[PDB]
Every structure is written in structure tokens, then in C-alpha cells.
Amino acid sequence: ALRGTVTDFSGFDGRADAEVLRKAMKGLGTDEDSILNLLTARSNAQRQQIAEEFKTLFGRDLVNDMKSELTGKFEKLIVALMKPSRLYDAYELKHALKGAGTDEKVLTEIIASRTPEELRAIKQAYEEEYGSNLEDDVVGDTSGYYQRMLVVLLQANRDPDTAIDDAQVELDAQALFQAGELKWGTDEEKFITILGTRSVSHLRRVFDKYMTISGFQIEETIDRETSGNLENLLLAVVKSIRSIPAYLAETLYYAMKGAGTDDHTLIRVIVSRSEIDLFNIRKEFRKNFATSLYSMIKGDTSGDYKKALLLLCGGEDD
Ligand SMILES: NCCOP(=O)(O)OC[C@H](O)CO
Ligand SMILES: [Ca+2]
Ligand SMILES: [Ca+2]
Numbered sequence: 001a002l003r004g005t006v007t008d009f010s011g012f013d014g015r016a017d018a019e020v021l022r023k024a025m026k027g028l029g030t031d032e033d034s035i036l037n038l039l040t041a042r043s044n045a046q047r048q049q050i051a052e053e054f055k056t057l058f059g060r061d062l063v064n065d066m067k068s069e070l071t072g073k074f075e076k077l078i079v080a081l082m083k084p085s086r087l088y089d090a091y092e093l094k095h096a097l098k099g100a101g102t103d104e105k106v107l108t109e110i111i112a113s114r115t116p117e118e119l120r121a122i123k124q125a126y127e128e129e130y131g132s133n134l135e136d137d138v139v140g141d142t143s144g145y146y147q148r149m150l151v152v153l154l155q156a157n158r159d160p161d162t163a164i165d166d167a168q169v170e171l172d173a174q175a176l177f178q179a180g181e182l183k184w185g186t187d188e189e190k191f192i193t194i195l196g197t198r199s200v201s202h203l204r205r206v207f208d209k210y211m212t213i214s215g216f217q218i219e220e221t222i223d224r225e226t227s228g229n230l231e232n233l234l235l236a237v238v239k240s241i242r243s244i245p246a247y248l249a250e251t252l253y254y255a256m257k258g259a260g261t262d263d264h265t266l267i268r269v270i271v272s273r274s275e276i277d278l279f280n281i282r283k284e285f286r287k288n289f290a291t292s293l294y295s296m297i298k299g300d301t302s303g304d305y306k307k308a309l310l311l312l313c314g315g316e317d318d
């Protein structure tokens with residue numbers, strides 16, 4: 001049911017492609033067009049094979065070259081696209097965590113939308129790539145129930161979708177109800193446990209009966225009960241349980257809606273998801289927002305960057 005826009009190129013030849021890329025750069029100038037057209041049409045496995053052949057034919061490192069040539073937002077996107085799939089989340093996470101500050105958004109966005117199977121592979125790589133443990137750095141940078149909700153999620157231990165038990169569904173909607181609305185203050189620790197560990201098929205059933213029992217949708221109670229980065233994170237978890245596609249479509253929308261563009265988010269979501277589920281994110285973008293994603297990107301972005309982005313996106317109207 002899920003599908004991305006970027007696929008493996010039929011009739012690929014690593015060796016052909018590296019000669020175009022060498023020719024696209026050699027000497028004065030840079031043909032940003034031959035690059036952008038080649039790269040947005042090869043799967044990311046295929047960009048790594050193209051980076052292999054470039055170094056065996058020329059003894060040059062394709063990413064460092066491209067980094068010396070290109071600039072600005074375009075460099076940023078092409079560099080994100082040469083990043084191997086199994087390392088790009090690990091990367092966005094390490095660079096969010098490092099330095100004094102920490103960018104909660106990236107942390108929230110990736111740890112909440114990624115499945116368990118994904119979160120495992122991200123800890124694996126992060127460790128073999130940076131020689132730190134992820135959990136430790138997250139804890140090193142955060143505080144409170146936000147840190148704690150992120151550590152629950154980092155354990156990648158959510159329950160399996162199993163046959164559903166109505167009794168447990170009513171049990172769980174009633175405890176949330178008693179942990180928030182019906183409580184002076186809040187019992188955030190019950191929200192972290194039931195939201196952070198129960199199966200996805202089961203909490204979607206909890207979110208409906210809770211609306212029956214309380215007259216509130218769980219997002220609304222989260223708004224009323226909490227503030228800060230924990231409000232954010234619980235909202236991000238609820239929306240990913242309901243739909244990761246729609247949560248990500250919605251994360252792209254608020255990147256482009258405003259007075260500018262959250263470029264870093266625009267890039268990170270299109271590249272990360274290009275091969276996983278950007279076709280579906282595009283469906284939910286339209287369904288929920290009347291604008292199509294192509295369009296939104298077409299009025300927000302200029303340059304080589306825009307063309308690259310739209311090529312990755314595909315389907316206008318879709
Ligand atoms: N619906 C209003 C929720 O207020 P609540 O978070 O449930 O209690 C306030 C806390 O004890 C303030 O210091
Ligand atoms: Ca050049
Ligand atoms: Ca140029």
C-alpha cells in the first residue's frame with residue numbers, strides 16, 4: 001500500500017552515469033542541469049554505485065566534488081540525496097543533537113514517525129557511524145517527560161497488532177480520561193505508557209471510544225492538558241498512529257505555508273521518504289489541503305533546487 005516517487009532506473013549503467021557527472025563538472029562552470037536530472041532519477045542505491053564508479057574511474061570523490069561546485073540550498077539537497085538511505089535519519093538526528101542547543105523538531109519528527117523496525121536500524125547505524133549511543137545523546141540533550149517519551153519510543157518496543165480486545169480498548173480510553181480531563185493537573189506517565197507502547201491497531205480504537213466517552217478527540221485533550229515539547233511530541237505520536245503519511249504531509253504543509261520556507265524540513269521529508277511513501281504523502285496532502293504538493297513547492301522554491309524538488313515529487317495535481 002505505501003509507495004515512493006523515486007525508483008530504480010531501468011537500464012542503469014554506473015559507469016555511463018559517472019562520466020556524465022564528471023563531464024557535468026570538469027573545468028569552468030557546472031552544468032547543474034545534467035546533475036539534477038541524473039540524480040533525481042536514480043534510486044539511492046544507484047547513487048551509491050554511481051559514487052563507486054566515479055572514484056574507480058577518476059580517483060576523485062563524487063560528493064566532495066559536487067560540494068565544491070554547487071552551493072546554497074541546491075548543494076544541501078543534492079548532499080541529502082547522496083546520503084545512503086540507512087544513514088540519513090541517523091545523520092539528521094546527530095546534527096540535531098550536536099552543539100549546545102538541540103532542535104526538538106527533528107527529534108520529535110523522526111522518532112515519532114518512524115516505525116520500531118526503523119528505529120532499530122537508526123540506532124544500529126548511528127552507533128556504528130558516530131560511536132555514541134543514540135539514547136544517551138537524546139537523554140543528554142533533553143529533560144522531563146519529553147525525554148522520557150522519546151526514550152520509551154527509542155526502545156522500539158511497541159506491542160504487536162494482535163486481534164483486538166474491546167475490554168482493553170474501553171479500559172484504556174477510560175484511564176486516559178481519568179489521567180487528563182477528570183484530573184486536576186495531569187498524569188503524563190499514563191499518557192507515555194499507553195501512547196508509547198500499545199499497538200497501533202489498538203490505539204486507533206482507543207482514540208475513537210475515548211471520543212465517545214469524553215466528547216473530546218485525544219488531540220484536543222493533549223492540547224488542554226499539556227504544553228511545550230511534550231504537547232508536540234504527543235500530537236506527533238497521535239498523528240503518526242492515525243497516519244504517518246498524513247502526519248508528514250501535514251509537516252510539509254507548515255513548512256511551506258509561511259513567511260519563508262522551512263527549507264531543512266522540506267528537504268529532509270522529501271528525501272527521507274522519496275522511496276518509502278511520498279506518493280501517499282502526496283495523496284493526503286491534497287485530500288487535506290486542497291493545494292497539491294507540486295504547486296506548493298512551485299511557488300516556494302526557486303532555482304535548480306525547485307526543479308530538483310519537483311522532479312523528486314512527481315505528479316502535479318497528485
Ligand atoms: N483544562 C485546564 C487544565 O489544567 P490542568 O493541567 O489539568 O491543571 C493545572 C495544573 O495543576 C496547573 O499548575
Ligand atoms: Ca567546474
Ligand atoms: Ca552554473
Ligand SMILES: [Ca+2]
Pocket residue numbers: 066067068069070071072075
Ligand atoms: Ca559548495
Ligand SMILES: [Ca+2]
Pocket residue numbers: 096097098099100101102141
Ligand atoms: Ca545539544
Ligand SMILES: [Ca+2]
Pocket residue numbers: 101102103104
Ligand atoms: Ca531547544
Ligand SMILES: [Ca+2]
Pocket residue numbers: 139140141142143147
Ligand atoms: Ca538530560
Ligand SMILES: [Ca+2]
Pocket residue numbers: 179180181182183184185186225
Ligand atoms: Ca487535567
Ligand SMILES: [Ca+2]
Pocket residue numbers: 185186187188
Ligand atoms: Ca503531572
Ligand SMILES: [Ca+2]
Pocket residue numbers: 222223224225226227228231
Ligand atoms: Ca497546550
Ligand SMILES: [Ca+2]
Pocket residue numbers: 255256257258259260261300
Ligand atoms: Ca512559503
